[PDB]
Symmetry: D3
Subunit: 165 residues, 6 copies
Amino acid sequence: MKAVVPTGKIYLGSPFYSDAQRERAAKAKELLAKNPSIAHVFFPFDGFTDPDEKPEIGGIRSMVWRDATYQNDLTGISNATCGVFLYDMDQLDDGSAFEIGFMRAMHKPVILVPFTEHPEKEKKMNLMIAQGVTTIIDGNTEFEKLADYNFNECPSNPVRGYGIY
Amino acid sequence: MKAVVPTGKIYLGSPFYSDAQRERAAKAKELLAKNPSIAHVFFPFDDGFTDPDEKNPEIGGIRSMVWRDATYQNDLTGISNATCGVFLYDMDQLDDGSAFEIGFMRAMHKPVILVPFTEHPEKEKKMNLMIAQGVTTIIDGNTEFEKLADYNFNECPSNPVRGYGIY
Amino acid sequence: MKAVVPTGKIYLGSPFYSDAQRERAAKAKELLAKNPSIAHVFFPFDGFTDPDEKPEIGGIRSMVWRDATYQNDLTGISNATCGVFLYDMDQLDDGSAFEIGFMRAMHKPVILVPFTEHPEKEKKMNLMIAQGVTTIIDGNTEFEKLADYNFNECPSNPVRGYGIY
Amino acid sequence: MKAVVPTGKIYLGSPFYSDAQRERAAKAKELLAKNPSIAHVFFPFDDGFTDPDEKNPEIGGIRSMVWRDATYQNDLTGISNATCGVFLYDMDQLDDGSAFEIGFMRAMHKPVILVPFTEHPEKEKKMNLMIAQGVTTIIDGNTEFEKLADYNFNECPSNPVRGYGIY
Amino acid sequence: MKAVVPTGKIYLGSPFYSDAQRERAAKAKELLAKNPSIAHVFFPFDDGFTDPDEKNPEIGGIRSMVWRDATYQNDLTGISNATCGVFLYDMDQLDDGSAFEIGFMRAMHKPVILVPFTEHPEKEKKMNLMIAQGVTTIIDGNTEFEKLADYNFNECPSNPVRGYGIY
Amino acid sequence: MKAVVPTGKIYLGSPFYSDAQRERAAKAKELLAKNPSIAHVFFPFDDGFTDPDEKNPEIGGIRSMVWRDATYQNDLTGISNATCGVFLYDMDQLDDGSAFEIGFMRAMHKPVILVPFTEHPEKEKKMNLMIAQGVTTIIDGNTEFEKLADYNFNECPSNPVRGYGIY
Ligand SMILES: OC[C@H]1O[C@@H](n2cnc3c(=[Se])[nH]cnc32)[C@H](O)[C@@H]1O
Ligand SMILES: OC[C@H]1O[C@@H](n2cnc3c(=[Se])[nH]cnc32)[C@H](O)[C@@H]1O
Ligand SMILES: OC[C@H]1O[C@@H](n2cnc3c(=[Se])[nH]cnc32)[C@H](O)[C@@H]1O
Ligand SMILES: OC[C@H]1O[C@@H](n2cnc3c(=[Se])[nH]cnc32)[C@H](O)[C@@H]1O
Ligand SMILES: OC[C@H]1O[C@@H](n2cnc3c(=[Se])[nH]cnc32)[C@H](O)[C@@H]1O
Ligand SMILES: OC[C@H]1O[C@@H](n2cnc3c(=[Se])[nH]cnc32)[C@H](O)[C@@H]1O
């Protein structure tokens, strides 16, 4: 069971708007970078340039750019052995959720690293995410577990203690 | 070409509970029921699984793993049987459950019809790239909702998302 | 949710050696034949002839026959919307199990109809089958449920009360 | 066993050049129309998407990315909805689009009926390994075209390719 | 061609508990550990999931749905990560768990190496068609078990099952 | 981001005829060998299965079903093990085997690098829709062949086909 070489190929999915989300991603990268079970980590926001767009994030983008960028992400999922999603429970990212469903449809494991800045609200989760994810590591209290998690086999850890939406 | 018998099997995805959202689903059903190209429609919230071993089933509480598995699988089964997905997509309150299955359906190479709804037309028209590119056909819920009754679900002609800022 | 036309396309998997197994299959067919939610039922033992085999069941078969026959079965699984397996708990059929795993890998629903002529033995099941199957209908006490089951949506019914092997 | 209703959903793949190719396609449709096992038939060249931004569109000419995506997806949607593929395979001028589709369908584990055509029945009979082993059923177009009218698409009985040299 | 680094990721499937079966798995590990083409080996029975909410975990009893889900998924995850499967197949006592994953792996188009074992060589040599055809490479456990240390898992060359009666 | 170890597993598809084709294949291997991102490279024509029952086997001649299955499966196994495909695509004589493989890989959602070659750089630039939209990255073989030595196969950056008429 002991890998002769790292085989964990990570698809790090995550929103990239607010500074918080930006901070989590930069850290998650630092953590995963210490994990000996990882061989490669892909982060989609690290892009394609359409020599025809005379372009802004959030603006109207060319179809060529859209296709190339969306494909770069699907390619990342294809090459990956598992997904790690810095999941924002406050501002739900539909892009991230899409990717989770896509990865599960491909039968790949998905580690959910939820984050919330509202401890007051009863921890609730949509069924699809709750039953779709294979392993959960609380981002607010276990973010560091990512540096040790064995990605060569991705041990399961069902979602529990969450009210199913 | 013209089908000999209805071939469309719809997986109707949509957020629920919310008053407006329930309204949409209800209207979506009526519209689909009028489509001659549809053989079957599956809506996840209709019937449910009852875990006789569940004391006071909290429709938002913890809920047993037995009910979770059985309910989740009923959804994957609907996706499996469907020929296409029709999603009543709320642009104001993004539903990750809906997004999950869109990606799940696209991974299976099945067509997905996105029906966006927004109560704030004055607000920015922006969509996540994965949704904008993942979807194969868009039908504005606020303006073309009625097209669901005429749309040919035997072939699901595509209609790329356009006119939305992308992030 | 009410189908305008039947959409249930059944892949009826089952051993076909003993007379018992042969009896169950003939009955399962009769039952399913009464179900209004079924549009078609495929039973693999209903074959290909290789005009080159100068052949016996259990004997050495030509590769052409093997390929054509195996494919006829995969084609049946491809066309099917769900599988119904007359599962023998006494004499485990690896062919049937293979097909269950194949169908689940394709995310299709699988109805397990177990049979046993040894009520004395503690009901035990292999994990993969127990967690792989989506719906179970006891063959010894609910065989008739197949005539009523709604195959247009295949309601879930997790396996319970079985010792996991 | 006997089907209560037609369940065959055919993806009719085919080059759409030379008068010979479009004529075979024509005949293919006629034959399929008379088959009681067929529920629906999709021919990629029958409809077509129209991109308003695209001016003076021409076949073989530079096309917009939007038109390309929509059209490609329409073909994949057809493959997804199909229960089996029927390819009018031109053995004289190999068509990579059809071959791409045969491979895509086999990856999805769907049956593929190959219907080869040659204007030179006397030249050597050779076939690429992937096509020869990828297809599940072969029906010669030059002498058995007509059985598309009777073939049982509810079950698609296999019939391995034999008699062709392999390269 | 020659790999720059081990690429083989094995999913070692096999029945357990039985004295002889445990022996095989143990020997299989040793043999694989000596293969230069292997980067990783996953054996389902090694480590396990503990459900802190499980009183007296009966290794054959009912067992919680939480443990079942988590354990089953650990297996599907091993199949997902693997590049190929190596199954210590007991021909005397057929293991449906092993058969399930063989089919699951073949549906994913992954290569499967079958390693049959029998304590009754005097008995009929027969194999189920699905196994005989589903498998891509066979290595007799009773006579070539040692080949597991030389086999190139970077390319998994096929070796069709032959010499077995088929039912 | 930077990979700890090479993770690119290439499926090198290519016709294996004319001296030109086998020479490109030769060069392709040389270039790939010098790419630090490549862990392994599979070329379908490098090894080969041998069927003892088969006597006087010849290329293009009638082959045994056992040889056909083994060889076809060896190619599918290669596609399964591969993280991406690289096709030395002959634009002058279309090869259905390569096209079949491109489609099979795209159905599995794997990236496909197309490397087109033409001995007539002046003739019209036209490509079949499925190939043009199916591939994720194009690298001209006639003027950019050499970048196979530097392309980042750990991530395979997309590069849509443009400049080709579509038919
Ligand atoms: O919501 C974030 C997720 O969706 C994808 N994504 C959304 N917008 C993107 C731009 Se602009 N560029 C690259 N990838 C992008 C990512 O996979 C990320 O996981
Ligand atoms: O298949 C996913 C669909 O299932 C619906 N759904 C079914 N039961 C659910 C409970 Se309880 N909680 C949250 N979502 C639930 C989602 O709206 C999604 O469209
Ligand atoms: O074990 C029985 C299962 O395996 C397949 N099968 C095994 N031997 C077969 C012969 Se001979 N002919 C046709 N199908 C056959 C069936 O799919 C059946 O479900
Ligand atoms: O992935 C399927 C493999 O899992 C093993 N397995 C893991 N835990 C199991 C319990 Se508890 N019971 C029965 N089988 C079990 C099977 O041998 C099969 O190879
Ligand atoms: O090359 C033959 C196959 O490929 C597809 N195809 C190639 N170019 C196309 C245009 Se322009 N429009 C729609 N479909 C097209 C067809 O599906 C056909 O089977
Ligand atoms: O036609 C080009 C492609 O198809 C395959 N192929 C066709 N005939 C073959 C014989 Se004979 N042996 C091994 N592979 C073979 C190759 O994978 C190549 O990419």
